[PDB]
Amino acid sequence: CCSEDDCPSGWKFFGGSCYLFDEGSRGWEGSKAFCESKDASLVTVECSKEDDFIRGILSGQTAKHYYWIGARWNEEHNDYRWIDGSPFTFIGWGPGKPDNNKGCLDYLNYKEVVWQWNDHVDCENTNGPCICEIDCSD
């Protein structure tokens, strides 16, 4: 429900959402907490246009090769899904993914995974940047 003018300074507008591409260095759980500290949440990716919007941003730098996003293995439902509890619609796994290690998802840029989703086994101690999202739904 966001418009351009709704995005906080340093956030980017796409597709009714505002996004923060945060260059800090945290674990997945740390990253979830960080986005919450901004009245926001790790990004959820509902469609291929949003997937490609994200890829366009991550592809414009080369320093970092993964960014945490808002999905992880879900014990209750026994699947990977968004942290808001909603199942995947768009499917964005890279070649050969998921490994099914009951881990946490990132966009990964490694070998044949070209800014596509990977499940990483370590939700705690693997430090990287992250992507937060708001949709101004109020």
As measured in angstroms, the least distance from the Cβ of 125 to Ca ion is 27
Is residue 26 classed exposed, middle or buried when 0-12, 13-18 and 19+ CB atoms within 10 A define those classes?
middle
**Residues in the site for a second copy, rule: CB under 8 A?**
1-3, 6, 14-17, 46-50, 89-90, 135-138
Residue nearest to ligand NGA (CB): 120
- Cα separations in angstroms, 51 against 58, 94, 105, 127: 11, 12, 14, 22
- Subset of residues 54 to 73 that bind ligand NGA, contact rule: CB under 6 A: 66
**Which of 82, 78, 57 shows the shortest CA–CA distance to 67?**
57
Identify what 124 binds: a second copy, ligand NGA, Ca ion, none; CB under 5 to 8 Å per kind.
none
User: Is 119 annotated as contributing to ligand binding?
Assistant: yes
Q: Where on the chain is the footprint of ligand NGA (CB under 6 A)?
A: 66, 106, 108, 110, 118, 120, 126
